[model samples]
Target: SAKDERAREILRGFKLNWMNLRDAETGKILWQGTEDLSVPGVEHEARVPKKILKCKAVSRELNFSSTEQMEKFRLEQKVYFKGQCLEEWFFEFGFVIPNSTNTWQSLIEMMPASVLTGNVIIETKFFDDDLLVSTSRVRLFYV
Candidate 1:
């Protein structure tokens, strides 16, 4: 039992910078980027004003750790925020397969594109520990 959990020690490599929800029309921003870069939470309002809808979502398990990952994830996030609405795209973490649909037992689970035409990307790393800090470079992807 503890074996598997023990393996969940920490993350190695991951990417991404920003996340957003758009106003399917006018290609404008419905929800925006964070002040100092971030991983916005899910389950928000779905209302939009103008045109396209990029279902851009950052993986919680691997979203916000290093602003380094933030930068990389942001690049990936661009794909989601810029793509078609509900056309789900994702920003995943490292050592994980490239955009694999299987999320079970995965360090992070993001929305997939196969079952529903979504652009799902893999997520990123967490801090070395559960506390406010760690010497081995860790982070709390979930805010």
Candidate 2:
């Protein structure tokens, strides 16, 4: 038998158009890029209506090793809609970064923006120790 553990969307979702990794404070562009994967019905637009919301959620892989930070850590998601911020998700996990070659990883969607089924614009922001490190912005259209 399995024991119980404490716990905690449908839209024409597409891959993120752009993502940037940078300094938390100075707003320096550390690394900025777009999703290489092709997404159907996704338009490549630079700007859209300024209307969206913020959403927080847990991440898929928020793990680390003992070689690095031994303390507690978490991965969160901030969702922005074309009109109002949708939601922000904070994931719960315990991981430490190990001594190994680390490279950049593409962005993925943990939750769908099913709340709003219209012309939508979204953005994803990544922070380290309460600092804005990365921000994925622009180009989420709808019918």
Candidate 3:
């Protein structure tokens, strides 16, 4: 009753995902002009740590291939996203299907990072269990 299709994660390159310049030792979100929105791309700035992982924990898990990128992200820091990918995500989702409430939509919405990078190509994968699924490939968006 279904067919395979490719879902594109329109990441506009490494944009800032979360920005909570704070004492990482305290877990306190140091507010220095944060962003509030559906995705909250660039929350603000505190300087330094130009990596994504260094900020507060994001609701999403930015994925990637290759250990090189993995190491880079581990160095995650400040950085920022100007709301292109996040906005586009909302816009694109509506295009997939209209007046709709399909389970697939949820998956699609969460596939791409709000401030991540590059256009990601997502394909359908049927999990044998747990019934849930899941980066890299960004450069003009988030780092």
Most accurate candidate by lDDT: 2
Instruction: Give per-candidate clash totals.
Output: 31, 27, 27
lDDT of 3 by residue, 4-106 (tens): 1111121211232333334444545433323311122232222323343454442222222221111111221111244222332211112212222222111
The best candidate by TM-score is 2
Candidate 1 ranges with C-alpha deviation above 4 Å: 3-18, 21-30, 33-46, 53-63, 66-143
Off by over 4 Å in 2: 1-73, 92-118, 138-143
Error of 3 at 128 (Å): 25
Query: Candidate 3: lDDT over CA atoms?
Result: 0.25
Report how far off residue 54 is in candidate 3 (Å).
16
- The residue-level lDDT of candidate 2 at 103 comes to 31
Which 10 residues in a row give candidate 1 its minimum summed lDDT? Answer: 134-143
Off by over 4 Å in 3: 1-9, 12-18, 36-143
Candidate 2 lDDT score relative to the true structure: 0.35
